[PDB]
Ligand binder design. Sequence first.
Ligand code: N2A
Length: 219
Amino acid sequence: ILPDSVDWREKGCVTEVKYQGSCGASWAFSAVGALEAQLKLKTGKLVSLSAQNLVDCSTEKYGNKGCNGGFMTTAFQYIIDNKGIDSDASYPYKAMDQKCQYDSKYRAATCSKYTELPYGREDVLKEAVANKGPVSVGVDARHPSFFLYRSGVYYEPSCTQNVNHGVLVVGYGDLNGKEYWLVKNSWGHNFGEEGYIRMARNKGNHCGIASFPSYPEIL
Ligand SMILES: Cn1c(=O)n(C2CCN(CCCn3cncc(-c4ccc(Cl)c(CNC(=O)c5ccc(F)cc5)c4)c3=O)CC2)c2cc(Cl)ccc21
């Protein structure tokens, strides 16, 4: 039996909203966000992890292009292969492509594995969000209605299932019966509902929210 609503922010499992600025590193913020939650679950401590570490180091071998986009899955694989990721404090976000500056001295997390969820399965996503934690997802964000969103449950008829922007599902619920996914963005505190957007849930994989979900785990 799954809870009707979840909000991982209420459990201390979500860090402050970040601002990617003019560097297309949403994939990096989505990956660290998911891992931050697992680190909290495991160690009891909440610390922002370095999105910049991913931008600079999870590069061509991982199919990523830093400020020109990437995948959360291969970000996790990088952390796995690298045997860690630095704290955001030690390796702060500069919103540009840099030389890899990873230093094991300032490692704040590791990752053992990651799991991908099946395409379009909102039922499976719900279950992972309830039972595992926040889940990294892609959405189709190429719609003025998306970046102009201020409040409520976002539904956009022109939205497609083909994803182009990485975000973090940190919960789910309903607003007077309109089901939603509670989504953490990386466009700062001024986007939407204090950095968050509530996006239509159980409406046919709206904006591809459930197209390519993944989440990491720490042994
Ligand atoms: C080592 N290695 C990989 O292992 N991959 C893939 C192989 C498996 N895919 C499938 C994962 C499922 N999936 C399939 N389609 C789209 C997204 C997806 C998810 C989230 C987001 Cl945010 C985006 C958007 N990303 C981009 O558009 C993008 C832009 C520039 C890039 F360089 C990379 C991605 C796509 C997604 O996860 C991901 C890594 C690789 C791909 C390349 Cl060209 C080179 C090396 C790779």
